[PDB]
Write a protein that binds this ligand. Structure first.
Ligand SMILES: N#Cc1cc(NCc2cccc(CN3C[C@H](O)[C@@H](O)[C@H](O)[C@H]3CO)c2)cc(C2=COCCO2)c1
Length: 765
């Protein structure tokens, strides 16, 4: 039955628009297989199309906005793109039609509407690019009746082991196709849909823009050779129309030119399924998917007061749809330094210089290949897997579709090496690498990241203890299935726990340090004078100078998060010996958080160093770090320390802004200093943790119940309204918010953990 649910989930999630790095494209969850991508651009001149053409996601003054209006990876959805440079409002509807043995069928409609500022007679080039990787697989464009191109549909017939037999149809579409009266029309036709079928080595098929442009350039070269010149030139849109040459190949370029508005369909028909997919099927399955998206949203994200209004419902649907719509499938080699240089042990003073020297050895090499199915922080800026971000992404996704979230967790833990390391940043294949400067590609097996995926597992365990619709919850509805998932994952969780304790260990014993436990002490590896990238809080101020005796209170709290999860999951599997050990470790972290990290002087938790004179010094920078044992759910509801932290959270002169909690106190010496990334701005992921812990205390007998209720009510309101006001004004989710102005700043399209706002609105934790 577990095995049977797994096969149904594989068949359900196989196809998607799983290329979030590009405006629109499809691929299945198979490394070497069939991939599609859309390109478009206005052409007004002989040289402009190279600058107007769109393919990979960006955000600049030329693009108003874009994103999913609705999306469920089992059904598909609808994306809107508002392009100022090309004067076009585009819609891309994608739908999946189950059937057959090869992951079903799918269809897409591309609709382009000129905006009010566009010339009514604008010429727009549209390209559908198709590639297929694999040794024993075939793809062939059926040639047209006509001499120079297609009057009707383009049919590609292909086959592979993975997909069996299939046809992919690009329909004629609706819209004016311009006609050239030039002499050239005798040899190239007056204007029509054309296909070029080509072959390149499999590993470069992803480079769709340069491949297209090499063909356009060959066509212009042919014009120069055959005496078409500036004495009497063809129109630009005809200069940039490829000569029809359909055939067999691993690359197929389908090109159309439209004058004014256009639409056309893509129909992928799996032969092993029922009848072939039609344009009438597409229209029906699109209407049905919207209905089902609507019904599910209302059950799962039931927005509570004061956000019950239709304005907040539209905001919620947009934040949620962009988060789940970033889900990608990535496949390829990773760049990893596997030297394990001893300098990476960071055991001396000045360890950052020694570790620089080791990095300048450049022993990193490509390894894999690996696959990953995951959500991403940002399509235009960060279109790849980040380890602690994915913990935040999956909290709303798990509400939507717990079986989807378990699949993404399973995908992440299948990356873990023998030692228990998962790289914090997954850059899988040349396409993923193309977006990342060579300097920032290399992963280091001594770099951790917060284990925020354990938070999702906690939500699953609580849900466990208490057909697309059926599959989305099969792993909770069928307890046997839930447990077997956990039985299989449990060892890898344990391995990661053991990896943190071997690789991220702090030094109690070699210094004048007294504490309950000799064992429980943690220090993040990887830290430089100005930075600690592995914590997630890049430039949050830490002990200066960095020092092998440092202890980090956030890291100890994350280790607490893991033990608590291992206790729950261990108990469930009856792993008795393990639970006795975890229980003793938890007890020890509870005591040692107080003995090593609590400051009575300052009334909060603090990181620690070793003095010029070799004694334990607390270093207190009031901010997110200061709250960490509260944020990770480690403090008893009656704790006096909790009460002092509630005082710090509520204090306007420290953390509390009208727009949410500040990353750093206005009182701290390092407020608004240097790059100011984590040194003042409001971050929705840490606000989300504070909101959930306040609510926990608010719905429980104890002394701070009513303090918590007031702070919960106001913080939820402030965070939601800040993200909402910015969305209404700009159309974007932002990376962080300015605590003086409330303005979104840094990166747009951050969906991204900013989409936690949908869970904050829906409440009832
Ligand atoms: N100004 C400032 C600023 C800082 C950076 N820093 C490097 C960096 C590298 C990868 C991802 C991230 C995003 N966050 C950083 C979060 O702190 C971390 O916790 C989280 O996991 C990751 C993933 O969401 C930042 C980059 C950029 C810039 C890069 O390329 C496009 C244009 O903007 C601007």
């Amino acid at each position: 039955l577990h095995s049977e649910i797994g096969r149904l989930n594989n068949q359900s999630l196989l196809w998607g628009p799983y290329r979030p790095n590009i405006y629109f494209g499809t691929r299945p969850r198979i490394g070497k297989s069939l991939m599609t991508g859309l390109m478009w651009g206005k052409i007004e001149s002989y040289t402009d199309f190279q600058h107007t053409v769109r393919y990979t996601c960006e955000q600049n003054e030329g693009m108003k906005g874009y994103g999913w209006d609705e999306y469920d990876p089992r059904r598909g959805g609808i994306q809107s793109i508002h392009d100022i440079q090309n004067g076009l409002d585009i819609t891309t509807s994608f739908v999946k039609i189950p059937g057959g043995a090869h992951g079903g069928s799918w269809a897409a409609r591309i609709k382009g509407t000129l905006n009010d500022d566009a010339p009514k007679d604008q010429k727009t080039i549209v390209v559908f690019y198709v590639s297929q990787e694999g040794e024993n697989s075939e793809l062939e464009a059926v040639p047209s009746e006509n001499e120079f191109g297609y009057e009707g549909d383009v049919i590609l017939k292909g086959r592979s082991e993975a997909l069996g037999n299939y046809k992919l149809v690009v329909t004629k579409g609706k819209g004016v196709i311009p006609q050239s009266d030039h002499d050239l029309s005798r040899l190239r036709g007056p204007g029509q849909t054309v296909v070029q079928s080509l072959t390149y080595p499999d590993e470069v098929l992803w480079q769709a823009k340069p491949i297209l442009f090499q063909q356009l350039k060959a066509g212009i070269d042919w014009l120069v050779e055959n005496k078409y010149d500036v004495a009497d030139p063809p129109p630009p849109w005809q200069v940039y129309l490829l000569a029809n040459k359909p055939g067999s190949g691993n690359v197929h370029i389908v090109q159309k030119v439209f004058e004014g508005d256009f639409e056309f369909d893509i129909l992928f028909s799996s032969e092993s399924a029922g009848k072939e997919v039609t344009s009438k099927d597409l229209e029906r399955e699109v209407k049905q998917a919207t209905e089902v998206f609507g019904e599910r949203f209302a059950r799962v994200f039931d927005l509570k007061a004061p956000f019950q209004g239709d304005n907040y419902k539209k905001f919620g649907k947009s934040m949620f749809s962009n988060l789940i719509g970033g889900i990608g499938y990535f496949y390829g080699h990773s760049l990893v330094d596997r030297s394990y240089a001893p300098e990476y042990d960071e055991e001396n003073e000045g360890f950052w210089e020694d570790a620089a020297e080791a990095r300048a050895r450049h022993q990193e090499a490509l390894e894999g290949p690996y696959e990953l199915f995951t959500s991403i922080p940002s399509r235009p800026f960060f279109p790849r897997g980040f380890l602690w971000d994915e913990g935040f992404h999956l909290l709303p996704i798990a509400d939507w579709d717990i079986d989807l979230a378990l699949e993404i967790i399973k995908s992440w833990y299948n990356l873990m090496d023998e030692d228990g390391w998962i790289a914090r940043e997954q850059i899988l294949g040349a396409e993923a690498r193309s977006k990342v400067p060579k300097e920032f590609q290399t992963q280091y097996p001594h770099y951790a990241n917060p284990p925020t995926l354990f938070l999702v597992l906690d939500n699953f365990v609580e849900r466990l203890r208490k057909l697309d619709e059926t599959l989305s919850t099969a792993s909770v509805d069928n307890p046997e299935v839930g447990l077997e998932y956990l039985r299989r994952l449990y060892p890898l969780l344990r391995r990661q726990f053991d990896w943190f304790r071997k690789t991220q260990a702090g030094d109690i014993k070699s210094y004048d340090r007294e504490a309950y436990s000799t064992k429980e002490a943690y220090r993040w590896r990887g830290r430089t004078v100005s930075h600690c990238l592995t914590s997630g809080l890049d430039d949050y101020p830490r002990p200066q100078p960095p020092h092998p005796g440092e202890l980090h209170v956030d890291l100890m709290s994350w280790v607490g998060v893991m033990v608590k999860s291992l206790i729950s999951i261990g108990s469930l599997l009856g792993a008795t010996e393990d639970v006795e050990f975890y229980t003793k470790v938890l007890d020890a972290i509870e005591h040692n958080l107080d003995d090593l990290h609590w400051s009575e002087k300052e009334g909060c938790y603090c990181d620690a160093t070793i003095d010029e004179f070799e004694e334990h010094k607390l270093v207190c920078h009031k901010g997110y770090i200061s709250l960490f044992p509260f944020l990770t759910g480690l403090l008893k509801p009656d704790s006096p320390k909790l009460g002092k932290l509630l005082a710090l959270i509520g204090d306007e002169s420290e953390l509390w802004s009208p727009y949410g909690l500040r990353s750093l106190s206005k009182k701290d010496e390092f407020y608004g200093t240097a790059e100011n990334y984590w040194r003042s701005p409001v971050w929705i992921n840490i606000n989300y943790l504070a909101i959930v812990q306040l609510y926990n205390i608010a719905t429980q007998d104890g002394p701070y119940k009513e303090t918590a209720r007031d702070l919960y009510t106001r913080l939820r309101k402030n965070i939601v309204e800040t993200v909402y006001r910015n969305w209404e004004e700009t159309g974007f989710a932002w990376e962080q918010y300015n605590p003086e102005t409330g303005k979104g700043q840094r990166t747009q399209h951050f969906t991204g953990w900013t989409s936690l706002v949908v869970k904050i609105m829906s409440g009832h934790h």
